[PDB]
């Protein structure tokens, strides 16, 4: 057997839909444990200037006692049954999920339905989670990796929903009332906007019975209004420079406007970002690394780390890169990075593009190993792409990409485009925006 | 927090083609670039006209004068 | 709809390669256009007084 056959022989994901609106999806395997969860089109982009931080609080309060299982009864019941419970909030996607034994599937689906539908929101507990979030916002303040990314969003998508942090400003956290949380819940947490994903050793029929028996209690449309639909966010080429010499290493994040979840170009952009690659000072290869930026950065010791990212949203995103370096290495790192973008736009060898494809080929198969990443992939895919995309379809789009496609696509999104730049730390060397903007096209 | 930091309003300084914060800039981007890069190109053309004449005149002084051409 | 100025950017001066070809050819035409125009303006300003106006006279 070969890689192309293995992709085809992979278990086919299956999806059913309840009458009340909920989508229910599953990936069957021969393993004994499983992951099952609930994915929701909810987060910071849906939030507004009044109720920014609602999705975070709700996540904070979610796993504290439900209306039928109070205090820490839910917590005790999940823990005692030998399973894990987890949650997160993306700017566009909130999600709760349980990792458990396959045997435990019915109870897991019930406790998920219990968390979502009938949440308590105890007033004494809101006042405690208020302090917890106020602690956690100071915990994020020290993390320079997160601060520079929140700034990148704030300046890339300035004056729009995407500029907002998922956690929200400290003032909103201090003044967020129960009325706001419950109204945010009643609006956004609903069946047609939700997906129930599962993955492991479990039968699709059974999951659909559990979803029908527990989740069909959710409402299926609106009050004829109150249906919020995403207005597109304006990308703005701009800079934010939090000058702070006291901190040890400068963090820079530069990006151009992204494609959006729907765009086929994403594949060629993933190949593109794989060619430039990513580096950390703990890497083995160093001077002999394939991606010239890493090789140059390793030999000269320009930076501690860099990583090319493609953050995606509904109709836009952030395509670019991130690096952490000494205060005297910012201009050089920036010069090599932009040099690599411009190079890839104008000249791209067939060999390095094949390496770029193979890195991405390996990335897809590496990532979907274990049940939790596959359950995430399902739950995310149905909210973003609409359907689950098979690995064969991905491979078709990777094999589609050759050198000319990478050049046509890189040059489309990068060449002569104003990039959103975010700098935090000892950033006196960080090049002027006109010089950065001059670097976004070439001498040619 | 650092989430208290929102970017101040540039609606005063912005161009008309990017004022609507619900609108994708990409459709205007090529026009916005094309306007500014036209100014630059028009300037370069205007200087190129001048530079050619200035140089040509100095070159012509170095060439054969009127009084030599007369008595040739 | 592709606009007026964007249509120039897209095909004429996105590349720096064609940017120069545009400038060069534009300057080549501009020289003919401007000189001819400003000559005629100066000659209309100074009507009948220059040699070319009174040349037919003595020739």
């Amino acid at each position: 057997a070969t890689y192309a056959q293995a992709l085809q022989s992979v278990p086919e994901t299956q999806v059913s839909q309840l009458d009340n609106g909920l989508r229910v999806a599953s990936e069957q395997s021969s393993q004994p444990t499983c992951t099952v969860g609930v994915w929701i089109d909810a987060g910071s982009r849906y939030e507004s200037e009044k109720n920014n931080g609602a999705g975070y609080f709700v996540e904070h309060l979610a796993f504290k006692g439900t209306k039928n299982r109070p205090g820490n009864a839910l917590e005790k019941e999940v823990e005692s049954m030998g399973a894990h419970l987890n949650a997160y909030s993306t700017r566009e996607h909130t999600a709760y999920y349980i990792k458990a034994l396959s045997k435990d599937l019915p109870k897991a689906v019930e406790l998920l339905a219990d968390i979502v539908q009938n949440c308590s929101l105890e007033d004494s507990q809101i006042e405690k989670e208020r302090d917890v979030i106020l602690q956690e916002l100071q915990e994020n303040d020290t993390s320079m990796r997160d601060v520079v990314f929140n700034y990148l969003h704030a300046t890339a998508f300035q004056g729009t929903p995407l500029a907002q942090s998922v956690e929200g400003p400290s003032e909103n956290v201090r003044k967020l009332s129960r009325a706001d949380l419950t109204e945010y819940l009643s609006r956004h947490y609903k069946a047609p906007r939700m997906v129930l994903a599962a993955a492991g050793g479990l039968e699709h029929r059974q999951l659909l019975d559990l979803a029908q028996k527990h989740f069909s209690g959710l409402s299926g449309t609106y009050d004829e209004d109150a249906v919020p639909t995403l207005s597109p966010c304006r990308f703005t080429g701009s800079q934010i420079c939090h000058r702070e010499d006291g901190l040890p290493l400068a963090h820079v994040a530069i990006a151009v406007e992204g494609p959006g979840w729907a765009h086929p170009d994403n594949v060629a952009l993933q190949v593109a970002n794989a060619i430039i690659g990513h580096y950390d000072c703990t890497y083995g290869g160093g001077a002999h690394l394939s991606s010239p930026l890493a090789s140059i950065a390793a030999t000269n010791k320009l930076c501690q780390s860099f990583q090319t990212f493609n953050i995606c949203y509904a109709d836009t995103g952030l395509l670019g890169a991130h690096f952490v370096c000494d205060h005297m290495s910012i201009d050089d790192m920036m010069f090599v990075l932009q040099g690599q973008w411009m190079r890839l736009c104008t000249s791209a060898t067939e060999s390095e593009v094949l390496r770029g494809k193979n890195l991405l080929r390996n990335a897809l198969v590496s990532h979907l190993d274990g049940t939790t990443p596959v359950c995430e992939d399902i739950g995310r895919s149905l909210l973003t792409y609409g359907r689950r995309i098979p690995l064969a379809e991905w491979e078709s789009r990777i094999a589609e990409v050759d050198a000319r496609v990478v050049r046509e696509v890189c040059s489309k999104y990068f060449y002569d485009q104003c990039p959103a730049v975010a700098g935090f730390g000892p950033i006196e060397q960080l090049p002027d925006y006109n010089r950065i903007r001059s670097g976004m096209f070439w001498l040619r | 927090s650092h989430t208290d930091i929102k970017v101040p309003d540039f609606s005063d300084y912005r161009r008309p083609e990017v004022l609507d914060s619900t609108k994708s800039s990409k459709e205007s981007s090529e026009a916005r670039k094309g306007f500014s890069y036209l100014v630059t190109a028009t300037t370069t053309v205007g200087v190129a006209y001048a530079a050619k004449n200035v140089v040509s005149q100095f070159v012509s002084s170095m060439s054969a004068s009127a009084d030599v051409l007369a008595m040739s | 709809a592709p606009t007026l100025t964007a249509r120039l950017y897209s095909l004429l001066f996105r590349r720096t390669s064609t940017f120069a070809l545009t400038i060069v050819v534009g300057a080549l035409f501009f020289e003919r256009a401007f000189d001819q125009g400003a000559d005629a303006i100066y000659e209309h300003i100074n009507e009948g007084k220059l040699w070319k106006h009174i040349k037919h006279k003595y020739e």
Partner: peptide
């Protein structure tokens, strides 16, 4: 490979140039 259309275009740019002043 990729510098053939660029070097041809710059070859044209340079060519008309020699026509430009002379």
């Amino acid at each position: 490979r990729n510098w053939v259309p660029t070097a041809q275009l710059w070859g044209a740019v340079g060519a008309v140039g020699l026509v430009s002043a002379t």
